[PDB]
Design a protein around this ligand. Structure first.
Ligand SMILES: Cc1nc(N(C)C(=O)Cc2ccc(-c3ccccn3)cc2)sc1S(N)(=O)=O
Lengths: 53, 50, 94, 150
């Protein structure tokens, strides 16, 4: 809401700037959709494959 | 789909070793013991929510 | 000769009868579902497949007394596990 | 291990030698615990001589039945820590029972820990004494090679 607040009514002189909501949400939480995409990356996050030879 | 011995496969379900937790493994050079994997309550949803 | 399997037998009306065995007549237990090599070979000739062939093959199928009626192998953490045995409990709508 | 690790006098920056030394020390620990498995059933081999002054495990009420064997105990009490059932580790006075002995599997997850403790003491002394200090050689027994016994 601070990214859409204006300081002037003229559309060509508007002070509103692009909003970070969706990009930030996708960057942090919706970036782990690949983990649940037939990859097994959720396992890779906490795999600890202890195979002693 | 590409089983080269069907009769063996059928007469493999009757061998108790095929369905026992600690059965004898069916000349071993090397052996790799997977004795630890992932933990518990470590889900990304759970760790993010916490 | 150890290590050995340890089983649990549920009897009627009740009573968990534990049974540790060194050898047992498993040939008798699996005899009912043992298909002779001739039978499996003949079915393979009739149906040269892997999905329609298994179909035909499947379609062709006292504590001491209760031993051969109910067994439940008991997990031993001391020993090493060699077979991935998964219990699939499927629920059905119809 | 010390004979092999002081044979690394090949010209190298001190930092490199610390790592190629710690690797060999860990490998020596590995070869020791591997050979420990092949003697896991020799309870007399995994035995500790407790003095009458040191804190001692409590005597099982059946060790008082050795007959003409209780007389041999004059100074040392040879104890082996076995693991009956689960979780509990109990001490067996080895020389107060007739032979051949029958015992639950020996708790090598207790004796090997102390043997390794003193091995890491020696290895931390040599690591922090020849090359730069600051490294306490620890072997992850509980994770790397604990499964063999427990
Ligand atoms: C700790 C953290 N902060 C986030 N908030 C603010 C919330 O849940 C807020 C909330 C959400 C639902 C309810 C509710 C109320 C009645 C019945 C079911 N539900 C109550 C409150 S989410 C959780 S988290 N990341 O652990 O799931």
């Amino acid at each position: 809401l601070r990214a859409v607040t204006t300081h002037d009514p003229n559309p060509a002189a508007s002070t509103e700037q692009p909003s970070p909501l969706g990009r930030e949400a996708v960057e942090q939480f919706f970036c782990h959709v690949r983990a649940q995409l037939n990859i097994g990356e959720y396992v890779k996050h906490n795999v600890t494959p202890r195979e002693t030879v | 789909p590409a089983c080269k011995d069907v009769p063996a496969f059928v007469a493999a379900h009757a061998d108790p070793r095929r369905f026992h937790f600690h059965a004898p493994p069916t000349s071993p050079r090397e052996i790799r013991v997977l004795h630890s994997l992932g933990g518990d309550y470590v889900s990304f949803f759970e760790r993010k929510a916490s | 000769q150890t290590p050995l399997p340890v089983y649990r037998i549920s009897m009627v009306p009740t009573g968990q009868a534990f049974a540790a065995l060194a050898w047992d007549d498993w040939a008798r237990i699996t005899r009912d579902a043992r298909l002779a090599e001739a039978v499996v070979s003949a079915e393979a000739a009739a149906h040269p497949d892997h999905g329609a062939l298994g179909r035909r093959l499947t379609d062709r199928i006292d504590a001491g007394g209760q031993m051969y009626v109910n067994r439940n192998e008991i997990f031993n953490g001391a020993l090493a596990i060699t077979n991935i045995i998964l219990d699939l409990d499927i629920a059905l709508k119809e | 291990t010390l004979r092999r690790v002081l044979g690394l006098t090949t010209a190298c920056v001190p930092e490199e030698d610390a790592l190629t030394a710690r690797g060999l020390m860990e490998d020596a620990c590995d070869r020791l615990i591997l050979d420990a498995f092949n003697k896991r059933l020799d309870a007399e081999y995994w035995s500790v001589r407790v003095s009458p002054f040191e804190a001692s495990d409590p005597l099982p009420p059946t060790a008082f039945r050795g007959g003409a064997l209780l007389d041999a105990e004059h100074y040392w009490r040879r104890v082996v820590r076995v693991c009956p059932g689960g979780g509990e580790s109990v001490g067996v006075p080895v020389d107060l029972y007739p032979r051949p002995l029958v015992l639950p599997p020996v708790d090598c997850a207790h004796h090997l820990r102390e043997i390794l403790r003193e091995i890491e003491l020696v290895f931390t002394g040599v690591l922090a004494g020849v090359w730069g200090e600051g490294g306490k050689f620890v072997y992850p027994f509980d994770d790397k090679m604990s499964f063999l016994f427990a």
